[PDB]
Design a binder for this molecule. Structure first.
Ligand SMILES: [Ca+2]
Length: 124
């Protein structure tokens, strides 16, 4: 529906489903095992993963698609900080998946911003 302030929830749910199904998301689906990779938190202040993003959305714990988008960009910025090289196949996966995410999130955010203006301003 046009001007739907709720539309982003289904749009983001769908986008996360497509990400989970993509081979490029394998390294990012689940929290890094901090007992297995004991220097991860020495480098990364704020871990993030797609399972936490999906669970947060399903819980209603995101206020806006902008909040969800910040957590997804954190997955990718964490990967760029923790991988040691552009030679890393994990880094390459993160760049492909990030480009895909940025392609689809832009219209979610612009459709939400328009809906929110309507929500606040309409007299119908
Ligand atoms: Ca790096």
């Amino acid at each position: 529906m046009s001007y739907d302030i709720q539309a982003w929830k289904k749009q983001c749910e769908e986008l996360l489903n497509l990400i989970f199904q993509c081979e490029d998301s394998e390294p990012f689906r689940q929290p890094v095992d901090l007992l297995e990779y004991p220097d991860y938190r020495d480098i990364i202040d704020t871990p993030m993963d797609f399972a936490t993003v999906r669970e947060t959305l399903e819980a209603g714990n995101y206020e806006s698609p902008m909040e969800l988008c910040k957590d997804v960009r954190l997955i990718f910025s964490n990967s760029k900080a923790y991988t040691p090289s552009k030679r890393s196949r994990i880094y390459s996966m993160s760049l492909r998946l990030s480009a895909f995410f940025e392609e689809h999130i832009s219209s979610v955010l612009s459709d939400y911003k328009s809906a929110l203006r309507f929500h606040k301003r309409n007299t119908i």
